[PDB]
Amino acid sequence: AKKEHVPTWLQNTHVYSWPKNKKNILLRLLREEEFVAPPRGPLPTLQVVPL
Amino acid sequence: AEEGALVAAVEPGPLADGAAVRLALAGEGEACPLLGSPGAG
């Protein structure tokens, strides 16, 4: 296949290549992202000090 | 007729004097500014 073959309305979403990205297909069927951001921390300390 | 006239010496009469006026700034100092925030890893 090629890019043009995908219907336009579908092209707006993710497209996976078989068999290269079958892991991504399985993860998507599980609604799981292959890469996940780590949890956020607190804001940095505004350590403004005199000169 | 030597009594015709006389020689006269001119002087500036009402002289006056005064002192110069100079400006100065009273007191001096400097408050420190603030700076800095920590980096992160």
Side-chain angles (χ1 to χ4, degrees), chain B residues 5 15 18:
Chain B
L15 304 181

Side-chain angles (χ1 to χ4, degrees), chain A residues 31-48:
Chain A
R31 286 128 286 179
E32 303 295 346
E33 303 78 354
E34 185 176 0
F35 307 96
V36 182
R40 285 170 51 194
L43 284 182
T45 303
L46 186 62
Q47 193 176 15
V48 172

Side-chain angles (χ1 to χ4, degrees), chain B:
Chain B
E2 184 173 355
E3 297 182 352
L6 296 171
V7 170
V10 184
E11 301 183 13
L15 304 181
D17 305 73
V21 178
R22 185 174 186 180
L23 303 186
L25 305 183
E28 50 179 337
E30 182 178 337
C32 61
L34 314 182
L35 167 147
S37 285

Side-chain angles (χ1 to χ4, degrees), chain A:
Chain A
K2 294 183 179 180
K3 307 295 183 175
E4 58 179 351
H5 302 160
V6 184
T8 307
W9 60 279
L10 285 168
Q11 290 173 337
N12 185 16
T13 71
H14 292 320
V15 186
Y16 300 110
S17 179
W18 165 266
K20 187 174 182 178
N21 300 87
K22 58 190 183 182
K23 292 185 175 183
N24 305 96
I25 300 174
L26 297 179
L27 292 166
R28 179 59 178 82
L29 287 172
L30 297 171
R31 286 128 286 179
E32 303 295 346
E33 303 78 354
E34 185 176 0
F35 307 96
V36 182
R40 285 170 51 194
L43 284 182
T45 303
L46 186 62
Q47 193 176 15
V48 172
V49 295
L51 294 176

